[PDB]
Amino acid sequence: SMEQVAMELRLTELTRLLRSVLDQLQDKDPARIFAQPVSLKEVPDYLDHIKHPMDFATMRKRLEAQGYKNLHEFEEDFDLIIDNCMKYNARDTVFYRAAVRLRDQGGVVLRQARREVDSIG
Numbered sequence: 073s074m075e076q077v078a079m080e081l082r083l084t085e086l087t088r089l090l091r092s093v094l095d096q097l098q099d100k101d102p103a104r105i106f107a108q109p110v111s112l113k114e115v116p117d118y119l120d121h122i123k124h125p126m127d128f129a130t131m132r133k134r135l136e137a138q139g140y141k142n143l144h145e146f147e148e149d150f151d152l153i154i155d156n157c158m159k160y161n162a163r164d165t166v167f168y169r170a171a172v173r174l175r176d177q178g179g180v181v182l183r184q185a186r187r188e189v190d191s192i193g
Contacts, residue, residue: 086189087138090146093185094135097150098128100177105170106153110160121160126152143189147182154178 101107109127110118118125131149140146154171161167 082193083138083141085192086140086142087135089185089188089192090135090140090143093146093181094128094131096181097174097178100174100181101128101170103166103170105167106157106174118160122156124152125156126150128153143186150178150182 098107106128108129110122110125112118126149131146131153134140134149135146140149154175157167157171161171
């Protein structure tokens with residue numbers, strides 16, 4: 073139908089906007105700490121600690137499959153990245169500190185994304 077097409081076009085455009093958001097958030101992780109899944113070869117007990125692992129490569133896969141229906145879903149996954157790290161790693165570590173800086177810097181990007189999503193509909 074024409075309606076399904078128009079709905080598909082909306083999703084495509086949201087995907088374009090989320091791709092730009094994702095690129096901007098990932099630039100705030102220049103050490104690439106959050107770029108890939110935590111390795112289960114190298115941290116074999118990780119899943120005993122963290123039940124829903126997340127990382128930027130995994131978000132990118134979902135994004136490119138148009139698997140984010142709205143900004144809320146995308147934000148949920150970004151928050152997992154931060155929140156998982158801040159639980160597994162102690163406060164005095166380069167990992168925890170990188171998550172705090174990513175959270176703080178990402179807030180600005182996400183604040184305007186929410187306005188753009190609402191604005192363009």
